[PDB]
Amino acid sequence: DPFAGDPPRHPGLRVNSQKPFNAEPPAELLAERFLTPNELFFTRNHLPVPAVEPSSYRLRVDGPGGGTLSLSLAELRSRFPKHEVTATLQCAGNRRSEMSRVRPVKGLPWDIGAISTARWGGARLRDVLLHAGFPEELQGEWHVCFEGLDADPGGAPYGASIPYGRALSPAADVLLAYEMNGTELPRDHGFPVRVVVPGVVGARSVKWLRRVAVSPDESPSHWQQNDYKGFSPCVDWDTVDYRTAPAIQELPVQSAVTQPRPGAAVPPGELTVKGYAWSGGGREVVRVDVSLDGGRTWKVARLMGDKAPPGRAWAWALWELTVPVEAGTELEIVCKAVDSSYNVQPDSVAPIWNLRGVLSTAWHRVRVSVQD
Amino acid sequence: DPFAGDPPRHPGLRVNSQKPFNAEPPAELLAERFLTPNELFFTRNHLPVPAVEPSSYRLRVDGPGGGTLSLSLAELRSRFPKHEVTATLQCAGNRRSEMSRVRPVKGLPWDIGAISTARWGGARLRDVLLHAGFPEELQGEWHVCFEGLDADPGGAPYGASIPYGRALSPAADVLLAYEMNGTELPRDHGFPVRVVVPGVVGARSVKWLRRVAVSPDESPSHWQQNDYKGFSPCVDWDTVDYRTAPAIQELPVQSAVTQPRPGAAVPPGELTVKGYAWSGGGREVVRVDVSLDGGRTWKVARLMGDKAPPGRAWAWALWELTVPVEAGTELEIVCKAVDSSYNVQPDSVAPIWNLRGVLSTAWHRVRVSVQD
Numbered sequence A, B: 001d002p003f004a005g006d007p008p009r010h011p012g013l014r015v016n017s018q019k020p021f022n023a024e025p026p027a028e029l030l031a032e033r034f035l036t037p038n039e040l041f042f043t044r045n046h047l048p049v050p051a052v053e054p055s056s057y058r059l060r061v062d063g064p065g066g067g068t069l070s071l072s073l074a075e076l077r078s079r080f081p082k083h084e085v086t087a088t089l090q091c092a093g094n095r096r097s098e099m100s101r102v103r104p105v106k107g108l109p110w111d112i113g114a115i116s117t118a119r120w121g122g123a124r125l126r127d128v129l130l131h132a133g134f135p136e137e138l139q140g141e142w143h144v145c146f147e148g149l150d151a152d153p154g155g156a157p158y159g160a161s162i163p164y165g166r167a168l169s170p171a172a173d174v175l176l177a178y179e180m181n182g183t184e185l186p187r188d189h190g191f192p193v194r195v196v197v198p199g200v201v202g203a204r205s206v207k208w209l210r211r212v213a214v215s216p217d218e219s220p221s222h223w224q225q226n227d228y229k230g231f232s233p234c235v236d237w238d239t240v241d242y243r244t245a246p247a248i249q250e251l252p253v254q255s256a257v258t259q260p261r262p263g264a265a266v267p268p269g270e271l272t273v274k275g276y277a278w279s280g281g282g283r284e285v286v287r288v289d290v291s292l293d294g295g296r297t298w299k300v301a302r303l304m305g306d307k308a309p310p311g312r313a314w315a316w317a318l319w320e321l322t323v324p325v326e327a328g329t330e331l332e333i334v335c336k337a338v339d340s341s342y343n344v345q346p347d348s349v350a351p352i353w354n355l356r357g358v359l360s361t362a363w364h365r366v367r368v369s370v371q372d
Ligand SMILES: Nc1nc2c(c(=O)[nH]1)N[C@H]1C(S)=C(S)[C@@H](COP(=O)(O)O)O[C@H]1N2
Pocket: A041, A042, A043, A044, A045, A046, A047, A089, A090, A091, A092, A147, A148, A149, A150, A158, A159, A188, A189, A190, A201, A202, A203, A204, A205, A206, A207, A208
């Protein structure tokens, strides 16, 4: 069994796949803390988890002239000044299950918790590439490709790429992280090294990093070319042409209600509604609107968190709104967020439906009842 | 009459205000060409148009140490290498009229044409500031403030600001433009000099530019502080607090149908539906979906234009879709666009309603009938 060596996990996780392991924290704990504990941070694995001997581990980075720089874990820690970045990773498939309600889709049936937040520590990718000899700027459209140590039966490794400008930008905060919430990277989260690409879909933050290469093209890997793309609601498996849509990089504005949970019976008097909101590309969440009547009337929730610099809001905003609720009533709780570029979320899922079940960002609706 | 000196305009414009002059091109011409002719380019004036003697004109730019650089029009043309940028300006109030249908709002009642596109030529703001002695990077949060030569009765000039980083970035393409579609700036469009801020709301592209200043704060002007902001649908004139929302800079994804026009009777057989789509922040439009049945089913339109570099899609994408239409039917034509960060447009206007009638980006719907 290829998965016998996988790490043990926290028992309260909502698991949608055991082999390979894919799980999310319970929604009731998801937004309990700003930084998601390492043991509850959602886990998305395409393959068996690599077992890595730290001292023999080498990160390979190809230089400008075709040479190869080879770095040990000790050297990655000692050569480059450690930088810390608090960033939220959201999977493209977050909230896929709401989409399947409209019309079945193929994919892991995530609820609202394929998102988590951590303070990451590591070398900046930028410094590693400047050390390998690359310039701050290359002419034209270049990409940085990453391969992981995890590989499918045929030997193809998990891989992804990001544009060269993002990799070299001081402000974009791309890390080759070896620490997570103050401790070393857990195995499920990429030990000993993963890429963390703030403001970008989870798929590009390659775990168990074995190689870094600069190329005039995007990663040729199946997951960069033939997956993690958004299509029209009309497209299906027989018509999809992956050349017609760009690989998902930055993600759009998103939010969900984490408390209360669907089907809850809540006591009359006061109700504290809670959730998260986040947007891609370093775009801050500037407002979260909450409705208790199915989206007819709205109130403004309180945003928690502390501001980040402009263009660098990599971490989610937790929100709450305490409201009066009358005995014997039925509530349809809805939330929608607005970002710093005034992007907003769409009313419904059908018009944004797609065959892969990705980019599920229509309003989250939670129906509960108020007891007598 | 303070407006006696205003320039004459093209007679086919859709004028919503004569004094001050505010007008949009006819929707049937709006998307006829990629570059909007200067005579049809929408015009948004808050005040009387300044009459400027070109030779006595001086642009004032305050240096880092409190000194003032003063530039003539000849020097702006000769000192700095001319750069050309094709960019779309969209007013915050575009499509306000659709919002008033839900609940009356105060503001010029724009239809879908408070947007236009031109190739602008001028000095880069960046070069002008480096020439004034500023560094490429200032520590902290700095702004570049612009004042126009147009001033209200009390003597306050039109003014706005953009973040310092945007002004100094080579990629952001901010210009001090003296040319428009190959000719000198028309008076209504800022002669002799205007700022053009690509990917940003029209309000910041200050016309009839008299001054440029760097400040640790945003423009103190009324239009930067107490206008061009987005609020919750619940906010009204008695509750609005302009300190609670950020000034609009980048705009969200937008699109409209320009052909056919509402109420049209179209011949059976084939119908060519046309429109525009654009997104802020240099984010390319990656897809436009079109429905003929009120948003139940969708097809993908053809995008016209030529690609721009990543992060620099400053100009709109014109689209078209030729479709079969059966005699005696009723169509509800709808369009929605998706940008490079997979941001999308919301189904309806009510949930995005606000007191100023700004940020009107819900799906545009056009009802027509097919003859027999
Ligand atoms: N090598 C490796 N990198 C990987 C993956 C993987 O299967 N292999 N999954 C990716 C995707 S789709 C997701 S959403 C994130 C999830 O990171 P997490 O498990 O630490 O939450 O890691 C990405 N990096």
